[PDB]
Amino acid sequence: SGQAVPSDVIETRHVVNYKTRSESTLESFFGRSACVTILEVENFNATTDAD
Amino acid sequence: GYSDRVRQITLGNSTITTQEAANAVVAYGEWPSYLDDKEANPIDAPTEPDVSSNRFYTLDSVQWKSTSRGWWWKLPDALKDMGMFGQNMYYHYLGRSGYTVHVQCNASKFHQGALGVFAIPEYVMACNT
Ligand SMILES: [Ca+2]
Ligand SMILES: [Cl-]
């Protein structure tokens, strides 16, 4: 891939970056309970195979 | 010799004198300063125009009458057409500035009246509908 960063192609000031990639770790990306299916069941007096 | 009433302010090629001041306010007790590397955001080398832009610009005067209800300006809006400050402001996406605001109103020992002069952060005003 291209590797160049801004300091390679423009005049840059010093900027201290305190920001982290905490929320894009795999644990953070996947760290959610997701609905994967909806099942149905019933309770009634069943008189047919289908019921 | 030195007096709370007598002050000189020099910025760039511009000087103000007053012989009837009342001290000076430094808003929230903090002098303006450049943006530190540990608080910086955009990463391009900034333009710091210094004396070209950091100088006294005098607006059109207004007339105080017995019927005047008052005046407002916004900053940096009031200076948007002022010399190299205006040019630097409009050639760049981003800008920051402090200000020395000097409000001037002389009369005589026989006139009376009092102006409140307020610097308001985020001076959001009501609409007229
Ligand atoms: Ca460079
Ligand atoms: Cl004028």
TrEMBL record, chain A:
Coiled coil (UniProt feature): none
Binding site for Ca(2+) 5: 7, 10
Residues that span the membrane, as ranges: none
Location relative to the cell: Host cytoplasmic vesicle membrane; Host nucleus; Virion
Binding site for Ca(2+) 4: 17
Subunit note: Capsid protein VP1: Interacts with capsid protein VP0, and capsid protein VP3 to form heterotrimeric protomers. Five protomers subsequently associate to form pentamers which serve as building blocks for the capsid. Interacts with capsid protein VP2, capsid protein VP3 and capsid protein VP4 following cleavage of capsid protein VP0. Interacts with RNA-directed RNA polymerase.
Protein role: Capsid protein VP0: Component of immature procapsids, which is cleaved into capsid proteins VP4 and VP2 after maturation. Allows the capsid to remain inactive before the maturation step. Plays an essential role in the virus replication cycle by acting as a viroporin. Creates a pore in the host endoplasmic reticulum and as a consequence releases Ca2+ in the cytoplasm of infected cell. In turn, high levels of cytoplasmic calcium may trigger membrane trafficking and transport of viral ER-associated proteins to viroplasms, sites of viral genome replication.
Entry's family note: Belongs to the picornaviruses polyprotein family.
Name of the protein: Genome polyprotein
Species for this entry: Coxsackievirus A24
Full protein stretch here: 632 to 682 of 2214
Automatic annotation (TrEMBL), chain B:
Binding of Ca(2+) 2, residues: 48
Cell location: Host cytoplasmic vesicle membrane; Host nucleus; Virion
Superkingdom as given in the UniProt entry: Viruses
Subunit structure: Capsid protein VP1: Interacts with capsid protein VP0, and capsid protein VP3 to form heterotrimeric protomers. Five protomers subsequently associate to form pentamers which serve as building blocks for the capsid. Interacts with capsid protein VP2, capsid protein VP3 and capsid protein VP4 following cleavage of capsid protein VP0.
Job of this protein: Capsid protein VP0: Component of immature procapsids, which is cleaved into capsid proteins VP4 and VP2 after maturation. Allows the capsid to remain inactive before the maturation step.
Family the entry assigns: Belongs to the picornaviruses polyprotein family.
Name of the protein in question: Genome polyprotein
